[PDB]
Design a protein around this ligand. Structure first.
Ligand code: GTP
Ligand code: MG
Lengths: 196, 164
């Protein structure tokens, strides 16, 4: 139960990257955010960071005066921005904090992830996050994917494979300011049931 | 800042002309003929007058879209939220449209119309299925609406008026 989502996350991670490797076998071509498998990959990587967060890190709202008259789809809004800042160079933090259209901590987390993929740095960041275990304790319950020693070894090995692709994902879209369903369902925070 | 222009684009049958008629007159109608070329109406809302260019969405009119989007205050991209078969084409035409340099920076409001239909996709499902997060060069937003039963027409208008 507290870890039921972990196999689901791992399958989507592996499956989406294998899909990307087979499609980008021209291999002189960049993966963009117009590619559905790249976005599925991003959703699975977001689910890694969402899984097992303490409830205090799940917001009812993302921020901004964005009208809630629509969005009759209310979704929880996980946020972990200071965890990411702790392992990031000030010049990346500064660029992320000054994005014209990204203006919520939700958006900054999701922008950070796509920027890290473009830079080829996801394994680098995870090694640091896994080295700063005390800070992880402040965001994650003991059953969380990121606090599971074995699954951490799986994830590092999976992330190493990402440098076989060249990413140019969009990390600056206003769309990043609020979550959608797929990362939340994959993480177990919302039911897989709700996907359709 | 009290006059503005919008262009409505998107695939045939998505509800663009219906949306214009509902904004201008409140008339919904179940029977419609596809728009040949373009349509236009001028509406006033408060102290804002809005000229709305309603372009045909059938394949042979889609080359018109880039031209009629040049210089406008905002672009409305209409989707039939209940027609999953058309999603691939609708997404392809959207990203193709927003690739054109002359349209750089123009705000875009994606509308998932026909929310009144059973198992219509909602705005968050459309955000994902349309790969909207690729669009990073402009203000961009996605609402679920229904021209038939008037859901979210209010805020749709309020969002567009913000760019007068
Ligand atoms: N159920 C439902 N049907 C709608 C809604 N809005 C429009 N329609 C129907 O969708 C059909 C197409 O409407 P149009 O407004 O002609 O679509 P269009 O986008 O203008 O099509 P083109 O002119 O070919 O680009 C019509 O039968 C409308 O009655 C809605 O909100 N709910
Ligand atoms: Mg029409």
């Amino acid at each position: 139960d507290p870890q039921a989502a972990i196999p689901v996350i791992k399958k989507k991670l592996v499956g989406s990257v294998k899909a990307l490797q087979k499609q980008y076998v021209s291999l002189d071509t960049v993966v963009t955010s117009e590619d559905g498998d790249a976005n599925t990959m991003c959703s699975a990587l977001e689910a890694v960071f969402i899984h097992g967060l303490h409830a205090k890190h799940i917001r009812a709202e993302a921020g901004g005066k964005r009208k809630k008259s629509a969005h009759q789809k209310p979704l929880p809004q996980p946020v972990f921005w200071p965890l990411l800042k702790a392992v990031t160079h000030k010049h990346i933090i500064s660029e992320l904090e000054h994005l014209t259209f990204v203006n919520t901590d939700v958006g900054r987390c999701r922008a950070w992830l796509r920027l890290a993929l473009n830079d080829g740095l996801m394994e680098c960041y995870l090694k640091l996050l896994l080295q700063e275990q005390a800070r992880l304790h402040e965001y994650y319950q003991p059953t969380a994917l990121l606090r599971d020693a074995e699954e951490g070894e799986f994830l590092l090995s999976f992330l190493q494979g990402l440098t076989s692709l060249s990413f140019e994902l969009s990390y600056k879209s206003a769309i990043l300011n609020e979550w959608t369903l797929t990362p939340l369902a994959l993480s177990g925070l919302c039911p897989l049931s709700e996907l359709d | 800042k009290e006059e503005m222009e919008l262009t409505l684009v998107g695939l045939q049958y998505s509800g663009k002309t219906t949306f214009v008629n509902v904004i201008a007159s409140g008339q919904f109608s179940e029977d419609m003929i596809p728009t040949v070329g373009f349509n236009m109406r001028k509406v006033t809302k408060g102290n804002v007058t809005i000229k709305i260019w309603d372009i045909g969405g059938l394949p042979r009119f889609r080359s018109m879209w880039e031209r009629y989007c040049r210089g406008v205050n905002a672009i409305v991209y209409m989707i039939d939220a209940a027609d999953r078969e058309k999603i691939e084409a609708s997404r392809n035409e959207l990203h193709n449209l927003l690739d054109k340099p002359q349209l750089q920076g123009i705000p875009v409001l994606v509308l998932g119309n026909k929310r009144d239909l059973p198992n219509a996709l909602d705005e968050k499902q459309l955000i994902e299925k349309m790969n909207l997060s690729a669009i990073q060069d402009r203000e961009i937003c996605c609402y679920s609406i229904s021209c038939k039963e008037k859901d979210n027409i209010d805020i749709t208008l309020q969002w567009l008026i913000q760019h007068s």
